[PDB]
Amino acid sequence: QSYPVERSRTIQTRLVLPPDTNHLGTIFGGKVLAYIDEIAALTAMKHANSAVVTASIDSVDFKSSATVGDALELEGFVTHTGRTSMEVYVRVHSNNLLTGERTLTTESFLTMVAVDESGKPKPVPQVEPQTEEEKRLYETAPARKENRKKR
Amino acid sequence: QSYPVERSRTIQTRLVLPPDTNHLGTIFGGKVLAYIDEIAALTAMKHANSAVVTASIDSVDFKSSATVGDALELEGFVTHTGRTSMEVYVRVHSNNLLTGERTLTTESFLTMVAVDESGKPKPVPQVEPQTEEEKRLYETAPARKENRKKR
Amino acid sequence: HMIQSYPVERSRTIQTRLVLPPDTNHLGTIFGGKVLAYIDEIAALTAMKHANSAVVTASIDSVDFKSSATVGDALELEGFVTHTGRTSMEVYVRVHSNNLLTGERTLTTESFLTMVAVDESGKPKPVPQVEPQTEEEKRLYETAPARKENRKKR
Amino acid sequence: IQSYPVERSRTIQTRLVLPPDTNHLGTIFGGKVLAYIDEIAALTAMKHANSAVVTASIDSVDFKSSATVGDALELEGFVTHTGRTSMEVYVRVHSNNLLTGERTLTTESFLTMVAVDESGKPKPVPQVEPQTEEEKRLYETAPARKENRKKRAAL
Amino acid sequence: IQSYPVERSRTIQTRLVLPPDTNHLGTIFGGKVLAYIDEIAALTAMKHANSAVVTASIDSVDFKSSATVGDALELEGFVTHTGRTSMEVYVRVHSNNLLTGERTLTTESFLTMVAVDESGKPKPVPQVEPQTEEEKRLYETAPARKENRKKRAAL
Amino acid sequence: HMIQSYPVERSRTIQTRLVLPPDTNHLGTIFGGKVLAYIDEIAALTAMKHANSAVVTASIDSVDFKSSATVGDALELEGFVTHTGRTSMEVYVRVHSNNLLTGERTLTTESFLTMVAVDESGKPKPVPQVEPQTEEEKRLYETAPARKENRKKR
Numbered sequence: 001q002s003y004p005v006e007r008s009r010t011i012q013t014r015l016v017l018p019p020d021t022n023h024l025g026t027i028f029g030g031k032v033l034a035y036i037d038e039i040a041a042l043t044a045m046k047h048a049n050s051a052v053v054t055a056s057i058d059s060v061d062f063k064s065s066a067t068v069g070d071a072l073e074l075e076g077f078v079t080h081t082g083r084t085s086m087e088v089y090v091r092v093h094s095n096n097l098l099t100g101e102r103t104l105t106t107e108s109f110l111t112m113v114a115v116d117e118s119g120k121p122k123p124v125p126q127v128e129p130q131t132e133e134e135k136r137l138y139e140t141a142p143a144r145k146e147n148r149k150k151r
Numbered sequence: 152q153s154y155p156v157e158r159s160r161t162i163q164t165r166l167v168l169p170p171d172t173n174h175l176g177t178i179f180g181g182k183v184l185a186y187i188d189e190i191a192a193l194t195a196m197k198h199a200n201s202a203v204v205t206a207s208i209d210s211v212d213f214k215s216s217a218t219v220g221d222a223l224e225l226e227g228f229v230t231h232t233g234r235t236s237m238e239v240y241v242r243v244h245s246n247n248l249l250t251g252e253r254t255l256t257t258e259s260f261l262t263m264v265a266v267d268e269s270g271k272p273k274p275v276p277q278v279e280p281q282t283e284e285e286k287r288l289y290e291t292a293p294a295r296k297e298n299r300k301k302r
Numbered sequence: 303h304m305i306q307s308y309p310v311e312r313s314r315t316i317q318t319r320l321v322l323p324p325d326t327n328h329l330g331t332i333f334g335g336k337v338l339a340y341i342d343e344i345a346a347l348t349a350m351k352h353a354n355s356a357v358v359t360a361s362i363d364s365v366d367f368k369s370s371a372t373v374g375d376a377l378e379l380e381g382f383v384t385h386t387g388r389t390s391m392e393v394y395v396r397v398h399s400n401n402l403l404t405g406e407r408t409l410t411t412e413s414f415l416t417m418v419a420v421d422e423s424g425k426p427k428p429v430p431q432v433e434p435q436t437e438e439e440k441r442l443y444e445t446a447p448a449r450k451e452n453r454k455k456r
Numbered sequence: 457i458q459s460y461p462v463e464r465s466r467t468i469q470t471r472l473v474l475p476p477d478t479n480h481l482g483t484i485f486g487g488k489v490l491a492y493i494d495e496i497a498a499l500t501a502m503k504h505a506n507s508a509v510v511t512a513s514i515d516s517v518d519f520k521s522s523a524t525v526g527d528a529l530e531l532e533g534f535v536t537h538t539g540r541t542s543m544e545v546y547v548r549v550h551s552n553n554l555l556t557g558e559r560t561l562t563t564e565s566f567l568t569m570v571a572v573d574e575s576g577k578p579k580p581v582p583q584v585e586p587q588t589e590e591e592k593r594l595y596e597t598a599p600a601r602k603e604n605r606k607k608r609a610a611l
Numbered sequence: 612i613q614s615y616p617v618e619r620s621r622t623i624q625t626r627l628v629l630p631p632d633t634n635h636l637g638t639i640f641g642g643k644v645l646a647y648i649d650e651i652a653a654l655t656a657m658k659h660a661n662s663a664v665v666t667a668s669i670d671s672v673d674f675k676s677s678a679t680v681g682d683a684l685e686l687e688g689f690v691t692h693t694g695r696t697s698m699e700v701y702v703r704v705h706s707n708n709l710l711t712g713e714r715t716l717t718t719e720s721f722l723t724m725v726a727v728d729e730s731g732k733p734k735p736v737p738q739v740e741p742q743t744e745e746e747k748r749l750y751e752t753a754p755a756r757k758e759n760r761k762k763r764a765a766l
Numbered sequence: 767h768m769i770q771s772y773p774v775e776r777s778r779t780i781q782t783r784l785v786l787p788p789d790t791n792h793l794g795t796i797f798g799g800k801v802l803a804y805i806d807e808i809a810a811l812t813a814m815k816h817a818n819s820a821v822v823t824a825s826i827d828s829v830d831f832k833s834s835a836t837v838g839d840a841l842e843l844e845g846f847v848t849h850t851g852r853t854s855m856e857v858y859v860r861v862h863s864n865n866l867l868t869g870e871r872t873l874t875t876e877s878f879l880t881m882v883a884v885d886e887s888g889k890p891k892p893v894p895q896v897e898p899q900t901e902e903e904k905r906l907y908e909t910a911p912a913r914k915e916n917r918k919k920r
């Protein structure tokens with residue numbers, strides 16, 4: 001039992017609004033993190049057809065800021081699976097819709113675990129990579145899992 | 152000066168969460184309306200490269216509900232333009248990620264106006280329909296504009 | 303099963319709220335979506351007071367924004383049940399913005415929504431009939447069937 | 457010198473009680489009710505003074521009853537009396553039980569609001585003109601309450 | 612019979628003051644400060660009683676200073692005294708000026724929290740053991756405050 | 767330009783918050799994203815108190831969730847500046863959940879963030895050096911350079 005990465009790929013666009021932002025109008029790091037987890041959860045739920053929980057997130061380096069009201073664009077997809085777990089890759093851009101300037105904000109990996117109605121880990125289907133980027137992320141996922149185990 | 156409909160097409164997926172919902176867990180009509188306007192604003196801003204305001208929304212018939220935490224999926228695109236105004240079509244589905252059940256929630260049209268930094272209406276580029284659905288929505292937009300004028 | 307009607311006055315609702323930065327676009331004008339969310343909120347309160355039930359929004363009619371509030375204004379909303387079907391209620395909502403510093407009050411919009419009472423299963427449930435009492439209420443009641451025909455149409 | 461009827465300031469709010477607003481048994485937090493009381497008081501005082509305002513104080517608030525999820529809270533505020541830059545605002549809060557239609561008095565409170573100019577300095581406010589018997593009674597009794605606020609804040 | 616040190620209940624919160632929380636001049640709404648005071652009081656009382664709680668009352672709250680955007684508000688609460696099912700909770704609030712580092716006392720307040728069982732009925736609470744001199748003084752003076760709350764709520 | 771350091775104690779921050787339904791998945795477990803948002807919030811407060819400046823989040827290190835709070839628990843967060851660069855501060859944040867009904871307290875996670883002070887233009891700005899005083903603070907200070915090398919690496 002397997003599904004393509006495309007089945008669960010999720011896209012989001014959010015207007016950056018005053019409450020999301022700090023008193024100079026820059027988006028809070030924590031709002032970006034919340035949105036990253038939201039898209040990873042949606043992505044993992046689509047792949048597993050299950051409630052999910054976040055087991056961990058890898059380091060997140062914020063390469064650029066976003067300001068009120070840029071658009072924040074997020075993409076997520078499942079890159080690799082374990083028995084009950086899914087690695088999800090999320091890529092975030094900010095898009096200044098007035099100027100057309102679009103910049104990479106961050107990219108990261110999360111580990112999501114499917115759980116049943118009682119909260120017990122639940123087996124998940126395998127993922128089938130199709131693009132070259134997908135195939136590369138899948139081939140490199142075991143190594144990332146080993147670093148998580150070490151840390 | 153014109154751009155394809157695809158340039159401004161915007162997709163959103165949102166997890167339906169307890170605060171979005173009523174004490175029986177059904178999403179509030181008004182949250183759906185807020186999300187519809189948000190995606191229309193993003194769509195119009197992408198087309199016009201401008202701040203926008205909502206001049207009006209047409210009637211919205213809610214064909215189905217969404218529950219916590221379905222995914223709500225929204226798509227918006229510019230269908231037709233006036234001098235400073237854009238008609239934006241928005242289509243909303245609810246997706247029960249546990250069961251795979253996906254249902255049309257609503258579809259509607261909004262009228263967005265591009266405004267300059269001082270809030271004055273601003274000319275917008277024309278839109279170039281490419282699909283058959285796009286061509287049909289564009290051909291039918293003048294008639295919808297006439298009904299708005301009458302009402 | 304109840305025979306009596308309930309007066310419009312039973313469920314008439316007033317809200318007043320200061321316009322704050324979350325509600326507003328980067329030029330300080332309130333988002334249409336925020337006004338729409340508040341319109342539904344007041345319609346939901348009004349319908350719940352009439353039906354003493356959970357409710358869902360079946361539809362909203364077209365909304366034309368006649369003006370826009372600015373961050374810091376007060377938004378003033380009033381809603382009331384204008385007419386009833388079997389399980390459905392028409393709710394009329396009127397919105398104004400009030401500049402509290404200058405005293406300028408302007409009409410924002412007016413709207414009709416259709417609210418449906420639901421049981422704990424989410425299935426439509428009968429509602430009490432409404433009784434119009436003021437002349438304004440009676441005029442809205444008189445004109446409700448024509449409005450409902452258009453909704454049947456679309 | 458300038459005075460306006462109480463009715464100019466009078467403001468009503470209604471709020472739905474939802475799960476984020478309540479303890480795990482479904483009783484609304486005291487703090488949400490307090491938040492709503494100050495909100496309506498600020499609106500009331502802004503209407504009377506046509507100014508930004510700040511909350512100087514709130515008197516004690518005794519909760520006579522609760523409200524629970526899906527109920528509605530109804531608030532009403534009006535200016536009852538004024539000093540030079542300060543306004544006493546009375547607020548009453550009721551719950552409306554959305555299953556039975558029963559209205560219950562939740563609490564009542566007085567606040568002291570201060571009008572401020574654009575630099576945040578206290579600014580003169582007009583007087584209020586009581587018209588109902590309730591308003592006249594609250595106006596008549598306001599000086600004593602003001603004296604109590606002076607006493608309680610003294611060393 | 613059972614008693615616990617004040618320290619078991621003691622709770623600290625810090626909150627950033629942001630634009631949604633303030634008037635258009637940037638001064639935090641009184642109501643937000645009140646909301647935060649009840650939040651910390653509920654946490655405090657839940658820790659003391661290991662129970663759901665409801666707010667019975669808050670005494671008067673006099674705002675000694677303001678807080679403004681990007682400042683931080685610091686709150687501290689602890690149980691000072693108990694009755695059968697009720698707890699007096701003292702809360703202090705300071706602003707921390709994020710440009711200068713200056714801390715200013717914003718306000719202080721007492722609340723009355725009531726522990727409730729799963730049916731929402733008042734439930735017995737343990738006593739509190741004051742240890743600091745401040746705690747002993749607040750404990751010693753609590754009966755008089757309780758008597759005042761009885762008087763003010765009487766007909 | 768200031769010569770003196772500031773002690774860790776200047777900016778150490780504690781937060782406590784009840785877990786409510788917005789924070790939670792449909793089975794009542796708190797979202798990772800909510801915990802992450804609260805971790806950043808406390809790191810931002812801590813860094814602002816140290817630098818007396820606006821700040822931005824440059825990065826967060828990996829976060830492993832050791833347990834999950836349930837709606838109604840209290841989340842307890844503590845943050846403090848562990849080490850400083852020129853414009854950057856390392857912030858350590860520790861999170862626990864506390865079941866207030868049962869008294870059970872469990873470690874949720876621990877995390878390191880890098881916060882950068884910025885001027886009104888958004889450009890990095892120098893920060894004061896931090897002084898570790900407790901043994902815990904001194905150990906974290908001692909081990910910060912190794913952690914910073916890994917960040918330089920990625």
Ligand SMILES: CC(C)(COP(=O)(O)OP(=O)(O)OC[C@H]1O[C@@H](n2cnc3c(N)ncnc32)[C@H](O)[C@@H]1OP(=O)(O)O)[C@@H](O)C(=O)NCCC(=O)NCCS
Nearest residue numbers: 029061062063064065822823824825851852853854880890
């Ligand atoms: C991080 C950022 C401030 C770096 O700015 P810069 O123009 O490259 O300037 P510098 O190279 O002098 O970096 C400033 C400091 O950040 C540190 N830094 C930069 N990226 C970092 C990272 N990913 N992790 C840890 N530290 C980092 C630098 O080492 C430097 O430290 P130092 O001054 O003590 O020596 C910049 O890339 C940025 O604004 N990113 C977005 C931050 C943001 O907006 N976050 C909110 C959510 S999007």
Ligand SMILES: CC(C)(COP(=O)(O)OP(=O)(O)OC[C@H]1O[C@@H](n2cnc3c(N)ncnc32)[C@H](O)[C@@H]1OP(=O)(O)O)[C@@H](O)C(=O)NCCC(=O)NCCS
Nearest residue numbers: 180212213214215216358359360361387388389390416426
């Ligand atoms: C609207 C809805 C309740 C209709 O339910 P149904 O199973 O078709 O049952 P009925 O045909 O008996 O409809 C119930 C009432 O709604 C009315 N109705 C249905 N759709 C309507 C619409 N688009 N506009 C106005 N009234 C409508 C019917 O005319 C009927 O009125 P009546 O009972 O007075 O005669 C149903 O489609 C629904 O739950 N939609 C989603 C509502 C919702 O969840 N909104 C929140 C945001 S998604």
Ligand SMILES: CC(C)(COP(=O)(O)OP(=O)(O)OC[C@H]1O[C@@H](n2cnc3c(N)ncnc32)[C@H](O)[C@@H]1OP(=O)(O)O)[C@@H](O)C(=O)NCCC(=O)NCCS
Nearest residue numbers: 510511512513539540541542568640641673674675676677
């Ligand atoms: C209340 C405050 C404005 C008083 O201002 P001030 O510089 O002392 O100047 P004044 O003495 O002229 O006070 C203005 C009015 O406030 C009244 N006042 C001050 N403190 C009061 C209190 N604790 N309770 C009731 N009235 C009070 C004064 O009696 C005066 O009344 P009057 O003008 O009608 O005679 C000031 O202490 C303050 O800004 N507090 C913070 C308010 C705030 O920001 N609250 C929101 C949450 S922190």
Ligand SMILES: CC(C)(COP(=O)(O)OP(=O)(O)OC[C@H]1O[C@@H](n2cnc3c(N)ncnc32)[C@H](O)[C@@H]1OP(=O)(O)O)[C@@H](O)C(=O)NCCC(=O)NCCS
Nearest residue numbers: 485486518519520521522665666667668694695696697723
């Ligand atoms: C406060 C309340 C629980 C009192 O309960 P009750 O059924 O009257 O039962 P009791 O008389 O035994 O009250 C319990 C304790 O509350 C105390 N109390 C009641 N009202 C009080 C008030 N206004 N101020 C201070 N203490 C009060 C009583 O003195 C008693 O103290 P004790 O047990 O230590 O001797 C009840 O009136 C209530 O639920 N109010 C609403 C609370 C609420 O929901 N607040 C949130 C926002 S609406």
